[PDB]
């Protein structure tokens, strides 16, 4: 059954709760973003109302084939009424179309559900600042002090300079970027822009990108692999074997590959800075691991929560074991004692 952390008290709303069949009492199902864990169970067979961003609605329509009658897209930064209750969608700074939702309950309680998010100080000057938030449903993916990472902009700058140097040294080099869902598009778009190229990709991936309301998208991406010097492949192919195999397929138009694996955190965040990063190499193929995160670091999460000063926190990630919940509660109490709420 639907866990209490996916239910919004004193409404019949749920959030990211599609895998439990019909939820008893639920009149509106909210979807924060188009990642498979959150949408799990949604398909062309679903027949209840789904509320979401415009981008998330495009994806539901075109990729999952959910029938149009059941998709209720809402604009961002706008007070809207859903089944008699005031809501606002805010940018989550996660992947394209990802939202946080602000729910103003009839009794006067105010609840923020973050979805998946990367906390940022620009969120301190949104509609959130206008009133007290009593309850916070929090993306606790990286809720432990070891999880540090560079800014998105540091990582992109590194990627740009690396790619530009390699292709100026060898104009027959191909650049490959690995991918497994939506998110982290700035990695491949920024590399292509410094090389004066479009991004080449499969038909399924191109169809996904065509849903995302990216300005001038038709000038940036193509299904013609031949004509482009940046290619997208599934993350699972970003290894020496898969990359030599792809190089054989391109018809001797390239004689070297430079590949990037955008990952979350991995243990080598604890010593290395982005400027010290060096690739793994075997012959004419080099693979760079780059920690481009679309989740809050510990410090970013702590700052946001200390600013917001919620009366209660409801974790939404790593809640499956008592050890994790206990550890998280410890950090929430420290933050509260330091900040005086």
**Cβ nearer to Ni ion, comparing 246 with 261:** 261
**Cβ nearer to Ni ion, comparing 116 with 300:** 116
Query: What beta strand segments (E) does 124-172 contain?
Result: 135-138
**Cβ nearer to Ni ion, comparing 32 with 197:** 32
Question: What track of x and - describes contact with Ni ion for positions 7 through 46 (by CB under 5 A)?
Answer: ----------------------------x-----------
**Cβ nearer to Ni ion, comparing 35 with 261:** 35
**Cβ nearer to Ni ion, comparing 92 with 308:** 92
Q: How far is the CB of 334 from Ni ion (least distance, A)?
A: 26
Q: If DSSP codes are grouped into helix, strand and coil, which group holds residue 119?
A: coil
**Cβ nearer to Ni ion, comparing 94 with 303:** 94
Q: How far is the CB of 92 from Ni ion (least distance, A)?
A: 9
What's the rounded Cα separation, in Å, for the pair 6 and 253?
51
Q: How far is the CB of 265 from Ni ion (least distance, A)?
A: 15
The number of residues that bind Ni ion (CB under 5 A) is 2
What lies within 8 Å, CB to CB, of 147 at 6+ separation is 265, 269, 297, 298
Contact 256, 285 (CB under 8 A): yes
The one-character DSSP state at 64 is I
Residue nearest to Ni ion (CB): 116
Q: How far is the CB of 114 from Ni ion (least distance, A)?
A: 11
**Cβ nearer to Ni ion, comparing 116 with 185:** 116
The window from 47-55, 100-108, 116-124, 324-332 that contacts Ni ion (CB under 5 A) reads 116-124
Q: How far is the CB of 141 from Ni ion (least distance, A)?
A: 9
Q: How far is the CB of 23 from Ni ion (least distance, A)?
A: 21
What's the rounded Cα separation, in Å, for the pair 277 and 332?
33
Q: How far is the CB of 53 from Ni ion (least distance, A)?
A: 13
**Cβ nearer to Ni ion, comparing 6 with 35:** 35
Q: How far is the CB of 197 from Ni ion (least distance, A)?
A: 28
Q: How far is the CB of 21 from Ni ion (least distance, A)?
A: 23
Question: What track of x and - describes contact with Ni ion for positions 218 through 257 (by CB under 5 A)?
Answer: ----------------------------------------
The window from 69-77, 80-88, 110-118, 147-155 that contacts Ni ion (CB under 5 A) reads 110-118
**Cβ nearer to Ni ion, comparing 141 with 197:** 141
The window from 115-123, 285-293, 296-304, 317-325 that contacts Ni ion (CB under 5 A) reads 115-123
Q: Is 116 in the site for Ni ion (CB under 5 A)?
A: yes
Residues that bind Ni ion (CB under 5 A): 35, 116
């Amino acid at each position: 059954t639907c866990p209490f952390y996916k239910k919004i008290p004193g409404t019949g709303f749920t959030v990211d709760a599609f895998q439990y069949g019909v939820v008893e009492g639920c009149t509106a199902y909210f979807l924060t973003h188009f990642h498979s864990d959150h949408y799990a169970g949604l398909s062309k067979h679903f027949t209840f109302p789904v509320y979401c961003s415009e981008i998330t609605g495009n994806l539901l329509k075109n990729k999952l084939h959910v029938q149009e009658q059941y998709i209720h897209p809402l604009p961002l930064d706008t007070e809207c009424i859903v089944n008699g209750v005031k809501v606002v969608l805010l940018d989550a700074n996660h992947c394209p179309g990802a939202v946080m939702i602000l729910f103003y309950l009839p009794n006067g309680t105010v609840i923020l559900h973050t979805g998946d998010f990367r906390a940022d100080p620009s969120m301190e000057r949104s509609l959130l600042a206008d009133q007290k938030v009593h309850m916070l449903y929090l993306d606790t993916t990286y809720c432990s002090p070891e999880y540090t990472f560079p800014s998105q902009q540091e990582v992109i700058r590194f990627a740009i300079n690396t790619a530009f140097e390699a292709v100026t040294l060898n104009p027959h080099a191909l650049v490959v970027c690995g991918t497994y869902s939506i998110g982290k598009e700035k990695v491949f778009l920024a590399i292509a822009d410094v090389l004066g190229s479009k991004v080449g990709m499969s038909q399924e991936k191109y169809k996904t990108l065509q849903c995302l309301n990216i300005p001038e998208i038709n000038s940036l991406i193509t299904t013609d692999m031949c004509s482009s010097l940046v290619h997208l492949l599934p993350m699972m192919q970003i290894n020496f074997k898969g990359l030599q195999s792809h190089l054989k397929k391109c018809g001797g138009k390239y004689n070297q590959i430079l590949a990037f694996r955008p990952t979350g955190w991995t243990h080598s965040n604890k010593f290395t800075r982005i400027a010290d990063v060096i690739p793994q190499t075997k012959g004419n193929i080099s693979i760079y691991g780059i920690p481009y995160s679309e989740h809050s670091s510990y410090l970013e999460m702590k700052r946001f929560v200390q600013w917001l000063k919620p009366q209660k926190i409801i974790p939404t990630v790593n809640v499956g074991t008592w050890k994790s919940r206990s550890t998280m509660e410890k950090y929430f109490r420290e933050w509260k004692l330091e900040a005086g709420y």
